[PDB]
Design a protein around this ligand. Structure first.
Ligand code: 03G
Ligand code: 03G
Ligand code: NAG
Ligand code: NAG
Ligand code: NAG
Ligand code: NAG
Ligand code: NAG
Ligand code: NAG
Ligand code: NAG
Ligand code: NAG
Ligand code: NAG
Ligand code: NAG
Ligand code: NAG
Ligand code: NAG
Ligand code: NAG
Lengths: 345, 345
């Protein structure tokens, strides 16, 4: 007795009420205390069809995250097409918290236990839980931060890999530490990545991509052009909006089981040139938000790159991928690809 | 105009008065609502001498937690010097709360901003606040739980490392989640700790220790012997006193930047065999307390290990370390190491 239906979920967090961070302020009020200990009702002999690409759970998370930011991150000015809104935009404590989206009474959640599931298609290994796994609702483009990893091998996910327009989600097995910091220019920041570990990565990745492509020089190039949010690694570090230049990160061709990169430092590390912008393009809505100038002191963010968002060109013997992002729904497909809300009816 | 002086402090809490958790009941009456927003008076060109081992802030916290427990955790019987004292020992709601220790009018607090300070010695990066940070008064041995982390690298702390008799406090930069549980034997419990995260941990931990030892085999072994409280990771989970076996956790030698452990399960998590005890040796005083039989139903503490309490053996090319603790002041030095009460006079 299982099927596919739409039900209004709810969130359960391990958030503190005494915490002044906006994620906790929102969580403790908008969310339920964690279980904190349910159990997986593992199932054999059963196979179900998942689709991380047409899943309501991702929209429900999307909406909550938007509302979270509405309360949390207030823009000084929110210009939505010739109409501007002003309001109190106080600097605040900001740092994502794991969220567990749970199913109402009478409903349950399916969990694919295939450690290689691409997030679309059948799955002979299933289970059941009331809540999900903790999910840091991290807004970022190009690079997926502080997410979960692929247990075994790298997994590649695309609604249609032959369509160059669909966004491709790379799930690493091994995270790459990344440390963006704004030292004591006040808007001038940077990020550090150890090439060595970035190399092993883009190799394993290229090798995985290569499996889906018969024999073409697989190249990684910077995002063609467009909005800074999408053409650079942009994210929110401590309420502040970092736009990290990535041209020295996605730069190298990996053909014939080989690996060759570009843009490095004598320490053996890749340095990204970031800026903390006030004028931003909202990921929640087609509009622009303006915030206050950076806070004082060291603004550093020690994150782990656990996933990638890419985009093939398509159109001879050379497939080139470019960093992508924009639709944050994908940032949350990368963590909800495993799940599927089922009706016990 | 600064110096080192003793003044009777006071605690400020974000505690609710409608709450029946013994922590809130004591707090709201013994403490004062949080500021809840003072400001750090950051300082440059100034260096001060801290000593987390000779700081009265800790002794005051000690006495308050003792009193807190005196009201909160009623033993059925309390035996001290052959003198037994009985009383109502009603099972109660128990869950620690962050405590901020503030300085009276006429005094301030010195806060070290150096993100690598070992708790003892000079510090060129100082600040000033009226209160402290949210310190959970968690009573535990061996492992430190629900505390703060070292922002950057792992910090090792000891009054004198060359003195084996001095306890070492390990500050982690990445906590290890620990979930202890007594399932629906009624005194029989257990704890789950993922190996991988404990492996990265002890490795990082041994590497730091190795920095303090030119060239020796660093071994981690269970406490030599003594009372359970001290020979096991004992703590309080919801009024229930758990004594968790740690022999499969502190069991592995790590030499030549290597890492080699012991005691594992098929799932990839270290399980610790716990017993819930009624008769316990008081951490507050030299005596024993007898508590009521464990409450019924699931008793779980989903907590984070943020530090360690260790003991080097003393006495060739082999430095062995064992889990220690017992004196709770250390548990509270681990968080008061940064602070130091100064007179503005
Ligand atoms: C909803 C929307 C208008 C948003 C757009 N993407 C963005 O501007 C965006 O993520 N900006 C952004 C990203 C990260 C952070 Cl931390 C702050 C801002 C992608 C398209 C244009 C497809 N639709
Ligand atoms: C003051 C004292 C008698 C206390 C002794 N340590 C303890 O009994 C102790 O931690 N007991 C204990 C610890 C944790 C919990 Cl949850 C319950 C009981 C350590 C020293 C040597 C300082 N002498
Ligand atoms: C591009 C991609 O990952 N899609 C595949 C899909 O073609 C296949 O049917 C499924 C197996 O169930 O695995 C996934
Ligand atoms: C990393 O992913 C590759 C395939 O993408 C896989 O072969 C490898 O096992 C993963 N990491 C490890 C465990 O080496
Ligand atoms: C994938 O995209 C290509 C190119 O747009 C399209 O022609 C093809 O029909 C798509 N295949 C699937 C799986 O729908
Ligand atoms: C990977 O980066 C490391 C960092 O020093 C470098 O030594 C090595 O040559 C690189 N290998 C590649 C690009 O395949
Ligand atoms: C790669 O980076 C170099 C500089 O490090 C740059 O000159 C070159 O155009 C980049 N190649 C691309 C766009 O892939
Ligand atoms: C990153 O810097 C390079 C070199 O200065 C520049 O060519 C590139 O356009 C930058 N990326 C963005 C989008 O700012
Ligand atoms: C990623 O998680 C780490 C650990 O919680 C945190 O320090 C870092 O700031 C996070 N990065 C963000 C905010 O995306
Ligand atoms: C960052 O990644 C490293 C390597 O996997 C890991 O040890 C650490 O716990 C990660 N921190 C976060 C943000 O979870
Ligand atoms: C900590 O560093 C100070 C110097 O700032 C040094 O005097 C002290 O011995 C160190 N403590 C230990 C034992 O690590
Ligand atoms: C903790 O310190 C270790 C080395 O001692 C380092 O590798 C790790 O990145 C640190 N964790 C952080 C900075 O979160
Ligand atoms: C842990 O359990 C073992 C038996 O497997 C026992 O010998 C040991 O004494 C226990 N822990 C301690 C040190 O009390
Ligand atoms: C370490 O633990 C193993 C079991 O995992 C046990 O057999 C052995 O006695 C322990 N050795 C010690 C306590 O050094
Ligand atoms: C740690 O905090 C968690 C959540 O507040 C709580 O459930 C747990 O009891 C705490 N750990 C202990 C045993 O103090």
């Amino acid at each position: 007795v299982w099927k596919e239906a739409k039900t209004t979920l709810f969130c359960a967090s391990d958030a503190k009420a005494y915490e002044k961070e906006v994620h906790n302020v929102w969580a403790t009020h908008a969310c339920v205390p964690t279980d904190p200990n349910p159990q997986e009702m593992v199932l054999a002999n059963v196979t179900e069809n998942f689709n991380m690409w047409k899943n309501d759970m991702v929209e429900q998370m999307h909406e909550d995250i938007i509302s979270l930011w509405d309360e949390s991150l207030k823009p000084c000015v929110k210009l939505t097409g010739g109409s501007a809104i002003t309001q109190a935009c106080p600097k605040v404590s900001f740092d994502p918290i794991p969220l567990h989206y749970c199913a109402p009474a009478g409903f349950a959640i399916l969990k694919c236990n295939n450690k290689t599931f691409n997030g679309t298609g059948p799955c002979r290994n299933v289970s059941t839980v009331q809540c999900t796994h903790g999910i840091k609702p991290v807004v970022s483009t190009q690079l997926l931060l502080n997410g979960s990893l692929a247990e075994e091998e790298i997994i590649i996910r695309s609604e249609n890999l032959t369509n160059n327009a669909k966004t491709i989600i790379v799930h690493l097995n091994e995270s790459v530490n990344i440390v963006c910091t704004r030292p004591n220019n006040i808007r001038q920041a940077h990020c550090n990545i150890n090439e060595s570990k970035w190399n092993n990565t883009l190799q394993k990745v290229g090798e995985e991509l290569a499996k889906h492509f018969p024999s073409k020089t697989i190249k990684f190039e910077p995002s063609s052009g467009g909005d800074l949010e999408i053409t650079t690694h942009s994210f929110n570090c401590r309420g502040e909006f970092f736009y990290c230049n990535t041209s020295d990160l996605f730069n190298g061709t990996y053909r014939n089981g080989t690996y060759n990169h570009t843009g490095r430092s004598s320490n053996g590390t890749i340095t990204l040139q970031c800026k903390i912008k006030q004028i931003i393009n909202m990921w929640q809505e087609v509009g622009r938000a303006i915030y206050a100038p950076p806070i004082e002191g060291e603004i550093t963010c020690n994150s782990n790159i656990t996933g990638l968002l890419l985009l093939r060109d398509g159109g001879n013997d050379t497939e080139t991928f470019r960093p992508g992002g924009g639709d944050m729904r994908d940032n949350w497909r990368s963590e909800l690809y495993k799940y599927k809300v089922v009706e016990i009816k």
